[PDB]
């Protein structure tokens, strides 16, 4: 007569700028986008930390600047744009200053377990980037559709 | 305090992130009219709006 | 014999937004967790894991 069939499909493992583990993490609010837009899976820089008030002004990485933290994916604070999720100018940002997060990567080869993380001028991971960080790799290395993702371990500055 | 010298209203819901208010204008005229007339002036109504956070 | 596990996160603002629009997020995340458990059991059966023998 006929032969029945059964199929299978698996979900993806990660998404850009998504918390990877339940380990000890520290997400800092009270940060503002001073200028421009900040992607969910990119590092940020601290333009200025107000003394009396406490708000820290946050921008995108440029040449010769110290990275601070990675943006965090949220369904409420973030604004959907460019067929993606971004943080708009003049809005609060969830910055993770410690923990394990899924970054955006421009490299092509899997990294070692314990080694320094090098970013480029854009703020995305690159195997031979110029900007130097104190963070270390964690091991995860996957890809969501056509986007490459890498896991990093963040240390407080 | 600013919550005593300025009026406080309550319309927004706790789960809102944006709002919008509108204002309207009037455009028209009138004329002295005799009977057996077909030329009557017309009026209209327009408006604009602004936002908040 | 072996043991399995995962987790998920959510905030108060997301809960309030879900209750205010009829589209919860907690249920979707829980279903994703259960689906992940079932699929990893399938992976163990049909492919196994070398380090765990």
């Amino acid at each position: 007569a006929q032969i029945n069939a059964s199929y299978q499909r698996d979900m993806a493992i990660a998404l850009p700028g998504m918390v990877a583990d339940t380990s000890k993490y520290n997400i800092d609010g009270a940060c503002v986008v001073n200028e421009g837009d900040v992607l969910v899976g990119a590092a940020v820089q601290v333009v200025q930390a107000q003394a009396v008030d406490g708000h820290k002004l946050v921008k995108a990485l440029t040449t010769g600047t110290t990275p601070y933290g990675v943006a965090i994916r949220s369904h409420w604070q973030t604004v959907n744009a460019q067929n993606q999720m971004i943080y708009e100018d003049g809005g609060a940002i969830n910055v993770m200053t410690s923990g394990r997060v899924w970054m955006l990567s421009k490299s092509t080869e899997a990294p070692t377990f314990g080694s320094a993380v090098k970013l480029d001028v854009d703020g995305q991971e690159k195997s031979d980037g110029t900007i130097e960080t104190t963070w270390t790799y964690a091991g995860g290395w996957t890809k969501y559709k056509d986007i490459q993702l890498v896991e990093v371990q963040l240390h407080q500055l | 305090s600013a919550l005593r010298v300025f009026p406080v209203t309550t319309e927004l819901s706790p789960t809102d992130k944006t709002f919008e208010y509108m204002t309207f204008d009037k455009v028209g005229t009138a004329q002295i009219i005799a009977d057996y007339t077909d030329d009557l002036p017309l009026v209209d109504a327009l408006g604009t709006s602004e936002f908040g956070k | 014999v072996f043991r399995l596990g995962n987790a998920y996160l959510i905030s108060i603002d997301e809960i309030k937004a879900g209750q205010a629009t009829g589209r919860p997020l907690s249920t979707r995340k829980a279903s994703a967790c259960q689906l992940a458990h079932d699929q990893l059991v399938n992976r163990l059966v049909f492919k196994g894991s070398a380090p765990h023998k």
């Binding site: 499909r9 | 109504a45 327009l46 408006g47 604009t48 709006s49 | 059966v45």
Partner: peptide, 28 residues
Amino acid sequence: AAATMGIWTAQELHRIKSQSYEEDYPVG
């Protein structure tokens, strides 16, 4: 300028369908 120059917005005349489609992931 001032666009608008109107009384109704695009949101006020709009509909969101009750049906919602979801991607299917078979288990095995």
